[PDB]
Design a protein. Sequence first.
Lengths: 186, 186, 186, 186
Amino acid sequence: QFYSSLIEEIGTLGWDKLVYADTCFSTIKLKAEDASGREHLITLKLKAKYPAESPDYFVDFPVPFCASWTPQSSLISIYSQFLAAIESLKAFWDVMDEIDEKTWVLEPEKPPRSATARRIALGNNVSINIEVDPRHPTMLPECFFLGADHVVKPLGIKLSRNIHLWDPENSVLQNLKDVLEIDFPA
Amino acid sequence: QFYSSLIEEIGTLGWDKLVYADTCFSTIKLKAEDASGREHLITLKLKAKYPAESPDYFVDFPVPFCASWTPQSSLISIYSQFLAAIESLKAFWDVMDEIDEKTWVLEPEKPPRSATARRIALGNNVSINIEVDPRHPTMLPECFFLGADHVVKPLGIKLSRNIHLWDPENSVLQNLKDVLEIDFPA
Amino acid sequence: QFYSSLIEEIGTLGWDKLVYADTCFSTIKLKAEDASGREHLITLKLKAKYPAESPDYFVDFPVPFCASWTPQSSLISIYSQFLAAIESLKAFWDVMDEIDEKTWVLEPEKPPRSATARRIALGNNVSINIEVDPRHPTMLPECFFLGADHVVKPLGIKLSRNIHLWDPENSVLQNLKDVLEIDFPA
Amino acid sequence: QFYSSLIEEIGTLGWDKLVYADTCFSTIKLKAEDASGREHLITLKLKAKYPAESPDYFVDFPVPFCASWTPQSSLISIYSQFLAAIESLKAFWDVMDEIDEKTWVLEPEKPPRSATARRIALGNNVSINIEVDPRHPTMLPECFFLGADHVVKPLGIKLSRNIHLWDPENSVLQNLKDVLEIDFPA
Ligand code: PRO
Ligand code: PRO
Ligand code: PRO
Ligand code: PRO
Ligand code: NA
Ligand code: NA
Ligand code: NA
Ligand code: NA
């Protein structure tokens, strides 16, 4: 045939998935859109000995990603180990999406899909830092209050007193509104 | 040269534009997203004599599309004509998008981008047919009512009475509301 | 890499060796001329997974041919094994060529290079069948006569009487003449 | 398709005809075997604008060769204008082949197919130079005798006296033997 095993593999996935390739096709990017409408990219760098030797691949995830064990590799199987990981993280990105859409995020600026922390502005010179566990994203995040004692001490008290209200069936944002008894600036 | 230049041209275009190719790359589909967020596809069927022989191509437009092509042409050159045609039709698809989003369209069921006619229900017992000129999409379209006389007579009188109020700076739907003095079922 | 390396390998081999290829270059035929002026062809059927997956191949040999192949192999590497096998069989084809040129062969009609048997007419009323071992083509072959007893009895007696005179430094035809003390119809 | 119009043309002629190509396929050689068993090669150099612009091509003929007029070119049509020319010259190469096989040619050394002259040794310090007309190769060639008057003067006399014996239905060599009443050294 005129084309390499790589090209046959891409044709099988669908050319619509390939969103970048260098001239030698030694670097490619594949896209996947998740069930929630988010686009995710995986970059693969192919060596001379593909598919005997596994490609290097880079993703934007808040957890490690690792692919196959199989004797020879397979862009096909990898892309499917990428889709499964993406669906496994749906709850985490749902939580983060809502926070990013509805609140005033101080840090990070332009958060990648890998970012598990948000520093959210609550008011004049007060913010809350939350660290979300991407595998249990609707539980109580680690919270840290940044500001003067006159504002954050009472928040700490409400947090301890109202913690029983935390409902994992609700979003992180909703639970924060309920447990801290506050409104978030937009 | 042994290989065609097709692959080099796709690279220049950007692999993100290629959304389908058969195994021999004798048929490909390229996508363009217009300034208004709509996706449009062009299918090209190639022969080995490419580019000496123009590819066959198929688009979904409400007007004819015939590319200028010579042996100096490439995917990029037909793709650019395709984009220009798409932008020239922005006003037409803007008018149709609104009608399809806001009214009860009986025909076509799932209108292609080429469809210039709509049958719109004005109730369970009366409809209006419009035929829109894609080159002049906000002028008065050719229309007619279907339904019993007692239902259409009143519409017909309001139409001939308010026909002068038609404002090409307004959408087809808005003008119809103003002329017929009605509300469209959703 | 986008393209296979098949075309580069054919170039290394020399395009003069390629005597057939289908439109997709999934089937090719390579020719070798042996040291004795005989032409031999090998047909290879390739898949996109080449060279990770060994090609299928077909030759016209009187013994099995199984190439050593790994992902480091190329057309050149199987072609070289093919040439080595061809030269190893020079003595066999030298013996068969002489028989086919100088005697009246009844079977096969147009013998392929794989054919190790010949039925040779000793007249209009008697034949001898030989089966030649391609690995030991000048040893005494397995043979038998066909024909009426009065015609074969004399041949059979001369054979058992002169069987010791067989000289492996001589061709099969020459030895048969010396043992049977006869002349072969042309 | 993955391949250029050139590759499709070569596939149509048969890969067995292509006996050389450079890496970029900007230079190729095609072979033709004539009805008389002689091999002839045509070299073609392809430009960027093939097949709009005619390739350059080189042959080894004793007459000019020139190909098409057609609006666009065609390796196919050219190869067939090459085969026809080759068959047209069969008589000329038949005459030259016999001379080269049976006589002692002093010049040229290793004659190409284009060479219309032969200087043939007749004996100690005597030769004959013949110039054959490739379009009328069995007629009396232009003859010139190289040697001392005592040998060449009588040959000149025999040539004039016996010229009526020249028989265009016979080869140049045969006619020379008959008209000059001599034997040619081997
Ligand atoms: O009038 C037109 O142009 C459209 C094209 C498809 C059918 N009607
Ligand atoms: O607006 C309506 O009533 C129609 C009924 C079918 C779907 N929409
Ligand atoms: O004995 C052999 O090996 C040959 C092969 C083809 C049939 N007989
Ligand atoms: O030698 C012979 O007589 C056989 C007859 C058919 C062809 N050769
Ligand atoms: Na793509
Ligand atoms: Na709780
Ligand atoms: Na060839
Ligand atoms: Na004469």
